[PDB]
Amino acid sequence: RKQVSDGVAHIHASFNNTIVTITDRQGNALGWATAGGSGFRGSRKSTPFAAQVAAERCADAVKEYGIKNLEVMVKGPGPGRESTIRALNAAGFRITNITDVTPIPHXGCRPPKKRRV
Amino acid sequence: PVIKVRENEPFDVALRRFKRSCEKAGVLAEVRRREFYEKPTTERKRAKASAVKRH
Amino acid sequence: MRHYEIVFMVHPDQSEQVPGMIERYTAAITGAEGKIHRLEDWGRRQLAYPINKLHKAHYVLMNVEAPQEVIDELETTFRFNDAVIRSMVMRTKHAVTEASP
Amino acid sequence: AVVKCKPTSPGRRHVVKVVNPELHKGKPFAPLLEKNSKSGGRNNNGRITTRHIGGGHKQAYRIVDFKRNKDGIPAVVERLEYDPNRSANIALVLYKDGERRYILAPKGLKAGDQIQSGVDAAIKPGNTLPMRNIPVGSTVHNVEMKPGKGGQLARSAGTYVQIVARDGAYVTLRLRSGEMRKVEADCRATLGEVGNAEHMLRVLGKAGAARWRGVRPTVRGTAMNPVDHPHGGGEGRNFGKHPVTPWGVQTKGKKTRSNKRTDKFIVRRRS
Amino acid sequence: CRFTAEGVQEIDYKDIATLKNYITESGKIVPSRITGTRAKYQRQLARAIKRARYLSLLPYTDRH
Amino acid sequence: SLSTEATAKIVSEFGRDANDTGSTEVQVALLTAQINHLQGHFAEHKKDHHSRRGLLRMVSQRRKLLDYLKRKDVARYTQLIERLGLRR
RNA sequence: AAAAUGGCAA
RNA sequence: GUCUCGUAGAGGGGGGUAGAAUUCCAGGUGUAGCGGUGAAAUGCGUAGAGAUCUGGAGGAAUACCGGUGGCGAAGGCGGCCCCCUGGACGAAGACUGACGCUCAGGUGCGAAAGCGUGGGGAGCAAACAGGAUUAGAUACCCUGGUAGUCCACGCCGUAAACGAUGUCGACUUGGAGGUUGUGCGCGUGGCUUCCGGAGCUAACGCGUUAAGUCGACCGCCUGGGGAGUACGGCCGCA
RNA sequence: UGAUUCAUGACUGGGGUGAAGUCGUAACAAGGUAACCGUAGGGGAACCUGCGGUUGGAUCA
Ligand SMILES: [K+]
Ligand SMILES: [K+]
Ligand SMILES: [K+]
Ligand SMILES: [K+]
Ligand SMILES: [K+]
Ligand SMILES: [K+]
Ligand SMILES: [K+]
Ligand SMILES: [K+]
Ligand SMILES: [K+]
Ligand SMILES: [K+]
Ligand SMILES: [K+]
Ligand SMILES: [Mg+2]
Ligand SMILES: [Mg+2]
Ligand SMILES: [Mg+2]
Ligand SMILES: [Mg+2]
Ligand SMILES: [Mg+2]
Ligand SMILES: [Mg+2]
Ligand SMILES: [Mg+2]
Ligand SMILES: [Mg+2]
Ligand SMILES: [Mg+2]
Ligand SMILES: [Mg+2]
Ligand SMILES: [Mg+2]
Ligand SMILES: [Mg+2]
Ligand SMILES: [Mg+2]
Ligand SMILES: [Mg+2]
Ligand SMILES: [Mg+2]
Ligand SMILES: [Mg+2]
Ligand SMILES: [Mg+2]
Ligand SMILES: [Mg+2]
Ligand SMILES: [Mg+2]
Ligand SMILES: [Mg+2]
Ligand SMILES: [Mg+2]
Ligand SMILES: [Mg+2]
Ligand SMILES: [Mg+2]
Ligand SMILES: [Mg+2]
């Protein structure tokens, strides 16, 4: 239970789900939570509110480490992009930096075919 | 879009700056564009249609 | 002969070898009847992005007029020299002697 | 060049020849020749130990320099030659000191080309260096497995190895099989690929052409009687058993490598 | 268009200080419509920036 | 394309004067010079179809000039083809 | 989300 | 039509290289979910997934720039660098002296798919498998996934290969733009987008880039089906 | 011994016509998965799917 003052929150915001993983600065995971695991399934899972709850649950999960300052990395276009960050601030972590790490190819691989609905 | 919270800056102000930076970078638009493959014929047709509508 | 602008970057630990490298490269051009129109040593600079896990490199710029064959030989030398992490050879329309930015 | 024969007889219809105009038309260099009499696949007990070997054309052995240890002395390629003992062509090279040797002919090598071996040799096809002195990512052939032993890997026509990495006293090689193998960096290799890559495009065209190469017919196990082979037997075409060798070992997928001594050198099996 | 007013023959990849004006914080080349650069110079600018990126004078992206 | 020096030489050899760049003989000699030079290129680059279209235009242009010259003056035509080593 | 069909007449 | 000088360009062929990303492989941290949909399930995960971090492998494509932008006979062509190479355009002169236009047959080029031989194979994905949906669902949707997509070389010779508009030349009110030269704010060339006048058109529309007014040459049409099919020929490995 | 033309031939291919037959619903509206072109594979059937192409697609508050 080594005390980590400075951590990085990784937010994986997809259209279906939100995954929040808090790591040390080296990138070793300390705790995580998901919208799916936070008691939201189906339509509820892909909501900002569900993402918010996941952030809170992740904050509770890493309470022993006594992290004070969080750098935030946001990935993906999902609805949980901003709600999670607000929740982390509400949890009382000081947000030093906010960065978007969504991957973008410089061309890259052919994407899947268009859905016909 | 890398935002560093300045000293004596409210989180909300910093968050708004992050949102603005993402919009400038057009990260979300790029992601939506790359979700599925657009045939070049489809791409060309869209670009022409946009130009005609603007005119 | 043709005018080429050559920028090569050397591993920072081999920065000491750079003066000897420059003289050898210039010698090859002059030996082939080429002319060194401009030579500048920018020195160690911070890389915009890490190259080969290096955050700095020693930059050398040279503008030269030479036969294409000697330039090809110089490019092979750069390829097989471990010290030279990266190089760029560009044709120029005319000789450049004015100081670089 | 790859040439299809015209169908002037049934035995010629499917023949495809690989014709190299560069190959010397004359006799080989006599001082580097030795006799090599045939075995018929029989060992010193006089028993057949490898089936399907016998007959074929008489062949003289050419002493080929696999070691390439005459360092510091340039050599000029006099001529490329056919060698009946191997798929690759060979090159007769003349050293400046007046010594002649045969080497495996690399792709692109031609009469008049100059080659050299040693630590200080230039990185050019046909030159031989310790792999420590060869750039990573290079294509090489005639690779030694032990320093000074002589090349053992990538000697067949068109073959080559890639030096994928260098770590300490060892290099990692990608073999033609697709295996990743570690070899000592002091081991020598020749730059380039073995020549005669069109070798595999030949089509023998007729039974007799295999006989000329000393290959005797393969009789299928299922065509025999039980006493002769596990697959033997049956009234009509029958099988109904897992395929095996004549000696009863499964012959479709069962692995037979068993060498704990050399396992350390294998980074990744061919798969 | 500064380049038109300046009367520069060719934009230089070595001139990073100029180039930095025409790249965003993310490192993306800025559109000509925003800058007001003439098309001919915009093409020269793009080539210069790409050359500078290769030489590691400029970043391809804000997060290497 | 042909170098300035190479062009200038040809103009002198076949032209009445250096100013005489328009003469049929000069034009044909310039075309022959480029066609012969490009043979090396197309041996190396057999799938360079776009460039070959340019070559074929040179061949066609040369043919039309020779046909003009032959009707205009047979003797000049006979000398030119001999000098340039053309079949016709 | 799913969501088919309907003689030729005048 | 040639020469002289210069300009712009994803024009072509060859070789090299860079950064981003996906997948895979190895390892660290970490723990119960992940993924996916209209909603699900198949699938993946306690044999430690997903997430996160580090190292490695490999293929393919080049974000931004980027544009009713450019280049090309058409098909097409997009990171950067070099090598070889085609065309276009402008300026001011010089030169040749009708050397031109069109073109049956002929010949060459010709997207994608497909075919042959030898390679390659990340991603994607006909076929195929499973899960859904449904009355059924040989589909649409989901999870996977082989040919193929890539490379060399050869074949095929077709596309709503379209501007559904053959090529060349002359002539006939305007307006607003784009792009690329050039002379002295005003000119003068090349190419291109939109709008519109006369005229033309069945109408829609076209409108100096004509579908207007004329000339040269070629290709083609003659009610709908049957049928671009049968038969024969030629071509093709099919 | 060939060529050609005509007649005829078990059976078979596709075409047309005829009952208000049977199975679906592919197209026309965004025809409920825009349609169509070339090509390839698949499927009781109309067709479906891939790749590239066209607009001779609706929508834009
Ligand atoms: K190097
Ligand atoms: K047999
Ligand atoms: K049997
Ligand atoms: K039997
Ligand atoms: K029997
Ligand atoms: K004619
Ligand atoms: K596959
Ligand atoms: K015609
Ligand atoms: K008959
Ligand atoms: K349909
Ligand atoms: K189709
Ligand atoms: Mg055998
Ligand atoms: Mg042999
Ligand atoms: Mg043998
Ligand atoms: Mg056999
Ligand atoms: Mg028997
Ligand atoms: Mg037995
Ligand atoms: Mg039986
Ligand atoms: Mg049985
Ligand atoms: Mg060019
Ligand atoms: Mg054009
Ligand atoms: Mg294809
Ligand atoms: Mg193939
Ligand atoms: Mg798939
Ligand atoms: Mg699928
Ligand atoms: Mg047609
Ligand atoms: Mg087209
Ligand atoms: Mg047509
Ligand atoms: Mg014509
Ligand atoms: Mg109009
Ligand atoms: Mg037909
Ligand atoms: Mg329908
Ligand atoms: Mg439909
Ligand atoms: Mg439709
Ligand atoms: Mg289907």
Side-chain angles (χ1 to χ4, degrees):
Chain A
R1 282 73 173 177
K2 302 185 61 59
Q3 299 301 115
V4 191
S5 176
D6 44 2
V8 181
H10 301 266
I11 307 171
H12 184 96
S14 76
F15 283 135
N16 293 317
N17 200 358
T18 301
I19 301 176
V20 183
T21 297
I22 291 175
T23 67
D24 64 6
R25 301 198 63 243
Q26 293 70 243
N28 309 297
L30 308 178
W32 62 267
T34 66
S38 299
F40 306 91
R41 299 304 303 174
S43 183
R44 296 171 183 67
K45 181 164 58 70
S46 56
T47 59
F49 176 78
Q52 164 193 357
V53 173
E56 296 163 1
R57 285 179 59 245
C58 193
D60 295 308
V62 299
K63 65 176 50 179
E64 299 179 62
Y65 296 91
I67 310 170
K68 190 276 173 182
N69 60 108
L70 276 183
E71 320 173 7
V72 173
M73 309 297 168
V74 189
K75 176 179 301 182
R81 283 171 63 73
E82 68 170 64
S83 61
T84 295
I85 313 178
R86 293 179 175 291
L88 294 173
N89 181 244
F93 296 96
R94 171 192 170 182
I95 312 304
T96 60
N97 285 359
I98 320 180
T99 302
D100 191 294
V101 292
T102 309
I104 298 295
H106 296 167
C109 302
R110 181 182 183 116
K113 69 185 181 168
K114 186 180 178 180
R115 300 177 73 235
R116 301 185 294 285
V117 286
Chain B
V2 186
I3 280 69
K4 302 182 55 59
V5 178
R6 39 187 166 243
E7 285 64 59
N8 305 358
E9 171 178 55
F11 161 84
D12 296 60
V13 176
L15 188 55
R16 281 170 280 172
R17 176 163 53 114
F18 176 78
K19 301 176 194 305
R20 190 167 197 112
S21 184
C22 294
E23 291 172 2
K24 174 181 175 59
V27 173
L28 296 188
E30 192 71 9
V31 173
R32 288 171 189 124
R33 189 181 69 67
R34 292 170 177 289
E35 198 176 0
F36 307 99
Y37 178 73
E38 181 176 58
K39 273 205 296 179
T41 186
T42 306
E43 169 194 59
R44 290 181 302 252
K45 187 177 62 171
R46 176 175 50 64
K48 170 71 174 191
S50 68
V52 168
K53 283 178 291 183
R54 290 180 299 180
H55 194 89
Chain C
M1 298 189 301
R2 290 175 170 181
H3 300 92
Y4 297 90
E5 186 165 303
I6 305 175
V7 176
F8 60 93
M9 35 222 74
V10 183
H11 184 279
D13 285 311
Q14 281 73 1
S15 178
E16 314 308 300
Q17 281 63 62
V18 168
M21 293 165 63
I22 295 176
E23 82 185 60
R24 285 178 281 112
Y25 302 153
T26 52
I29 297 155
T30 54
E33 202 186 300
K35 319 165 188 173
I36 322 296
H37 295 275
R38 176 171 65 178
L39 177 63
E40 308 194 358
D41 189 303
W42 296 343
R44 281 186 297 293
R45 302 180 42 108
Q46 194 73 233
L47 298 184
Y49 52 82
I51 301 175
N52 202 2
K53 319 305 178 300
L54 314 166
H55 295 85
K56 288 203 64 180
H58 193 104
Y59 284 74
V60 182
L61 159 76
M62 44 172 58
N63 291 64
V64 155
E65 182 184 356
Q68 51 189 357
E69 299 79 0
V70 76
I71 305 297
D72 295 309
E73 298 177 303
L74 185 52
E75 294 178 67
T76 61
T77 299
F78 289 149
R79 173 183 293 290
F80 288 142
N81 188 358
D82 60 300
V84 185
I85 62 174
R86 187 164 298 175
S87 65
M88 194 181 214
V89 174
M90 295 175 52
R91 274 275 295 292
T92 57
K93 199 177 301 180
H94 305 96
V96 179
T97 57
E98 204 279 296
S100 78
Chain D
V2 172
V3 176
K4 186 76 218 57
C5 294
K6 285 198 177 179
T8 51
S9 57
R12 283 284 280 195
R13 179 180 292 283
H14 304 296
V15 171
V16 173
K17 291 167 53 175
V18 180
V19 177
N20 188 353
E22 288 181 58
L23 292 187
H24 182 54
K25 295 187 186 302
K27 291 302 189 299
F29 185 59
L32 296 178
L33 289 169
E34 292 179 357
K35 83 169 191 74
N36 74 117
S37 63
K38 300 196 185 296
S39 62
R42 275 127 174 118
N43 77 344
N44 64 352
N45 297 323
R47 296 292 181 76
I48 293 174
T49 62
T50 295
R51 299 185 305 163
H52 313 143
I53 300 177
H57 204 289
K58 185 179 198 173
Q59 308 171 324
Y61 186 70
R62 283 66 168 163
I63 305 166
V64 172
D65 181 16
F66 294 112
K67 288 185 177 184
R68 290 294 296 288
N69 58 5
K70 193 175 174 68
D71 304 312
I73 306 176
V76 59
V77 178
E78 299 196 299
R79 63 193 188 198
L80 307 181
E81 295 194 10
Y82 181 84
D83 180 353
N85 302 282
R86 70 193 69 262
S87 56
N89 299 137
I90 60 177
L92 182 67
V93 301
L94 173 62
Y95 286 86
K96 283 189 173 177
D97 60 6
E99 176 167 359
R100 286 183 176 73
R101 294 186 174 181
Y102 278 127
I103 70 163
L104 295 177
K107 178 184 171 188
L109 191 84
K110 70 177 185 176
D113 289 1
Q114 180 169 300
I115 63 165
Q116 198 167 120
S117 70
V119 290
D120 59 302
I123 311 300
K124 162 191 60 179
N127 283 358
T128 298
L129 297 90
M131 279 186 292
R132 171 165 281 115
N133 303 120
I134 301 176
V136 169
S138 298
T139 290
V140 295
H141 67 276
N142 187 47
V143 183
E144 298 193 310
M145 304 184 71
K146 296 184 187 299
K149 185 171 180 174
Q152 296 183 266
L153 309 170
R155 311 199 321 191
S156 188
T159 61
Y160 54 87
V161 159
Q162 308 179 61
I163 310 178
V164 302
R166 192 187 310 168
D167 309 301
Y170 285 88
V171 294
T172 303
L173 303 176
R174 183 183 294 117
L175 305 185
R176 280 291 294 177
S177 63
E179 173 176 290
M180 307 298 314
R181 208 209 186 249
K182 283 199 170 189
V183 173
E184 293 177 60
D186 288 354
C187 288
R188 291 181 172 240
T190 303
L191 273 296
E193 302 178 355
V194 183
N196 198 21
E198 294 176 308
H199 162 78
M200 61 178 174
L201 300 178
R202 78 200 325 122
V203 177
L204 294 191
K206 61 171 191 169
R211 300 308 301 278
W212 299 340
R213 296 173 162 68
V215 180
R216 291 193 80 248
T218 291
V219 178
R220 296 167 290 109
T222 198
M224 306 182 183
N225 294 306
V227 68
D228 308 308
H229 193 293
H231 290 183
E235 284 294 286
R237 299 190 182 112
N238 277 356
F239 200 80
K241 57 209 90 174
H242 299 298
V244 292
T245 69
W247 304 278
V249 182
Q250 198 264 21
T251 192
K252 293 276 182 174
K254 191 182 203 309
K255 291 174 168 48
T256 63
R257 174 183 169 76
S258 60
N259 190 349
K260 291 175 184 178
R261 176 176 66 73
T262 63
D263 279 345
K264 60 180 71 72
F265 298 132
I266 316 303
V267 178
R268 182 178 63 190
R269 291 290 290 168
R270 60 181 199 290
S271 306
Chain E
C1 178
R2 298 196 62 183
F3 303 101
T4 300
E6 289 157 358
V8 178
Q9 300 173 301
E10 287 87 56
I11 310 178
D12 189 4
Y13 66 93
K14 295 181 284 83
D15 188 3
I16 295 308
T18 301
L19 296 186
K20 273 175 155 55
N21 302 304
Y22 298 94
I23 69 174
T24 66
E25 295 72 59
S26 299
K28 300 179 64 178
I29 309 170
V30 178
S32 70
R33 59 201 303 176
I34 308 300
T35 59
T37 306
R38 267 57 157 180
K40 166 178 163 58
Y41 289 106
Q42 183 71 13
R43 297 195 298 285
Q44 296 180 2
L45 178 69
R47 296 174 193 119
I49 290 168
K50 289 161 182 177
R51 296 175 192 118
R53 285 168 171 176
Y54 169 77
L55 291 180
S56 205
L57 305 176
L58 290 176
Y60 288 83
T61 179
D62 52 354
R63 40 173 163 114
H64 279 279
Chain F
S1 299
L2 212 64
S3 74
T4 306
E5 290 66 56
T7 302
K9 289 185 57 179
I10 296 171
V11 173
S12 302
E13 302 309 302
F14 290 85
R16 271 59 72 187
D17 186 291
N19 295 359
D20 180 53
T21 64
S23 53
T24 304
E25 290 91 317
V26 157
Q27 292 196 57
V28 169
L30 292 171
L31 290 173
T32 305
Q34 187 61 191
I35 292 166
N36 295 356
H37 162 83
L38 286 181
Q39 301 304 124
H41 171 82
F42 287 111
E44 184 180 1
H45 304 279
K46 302 177 188 63
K47 305 312 168 296
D48 186 2
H49 297 307
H50 292 52
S51 296
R52 184 175 290 114
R53 205 176 99 108
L55 173 70
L56 298 173
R57 174 178 168 178
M58 303 174 196
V59 171
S60 296
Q61 185 180 305
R62 187 177 67 182
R63 172 77 278 124
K64 289 171 172 181
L65 288 168
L66 287 170
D67 293 347
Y68 168 74
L69 188 56
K70 185 175 181 60
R71 54 192 182 69
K72 196 70 174 181
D73 189 298
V74 277
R76 287 166 59 192
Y77 165 86
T78 300
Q79 297 168 241
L80 182 63
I81 61 179
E82 174 57 60
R83 290 183 63 183
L84 290 180
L86 303 179
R87 311 191 299 288
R88 56 170 295 247

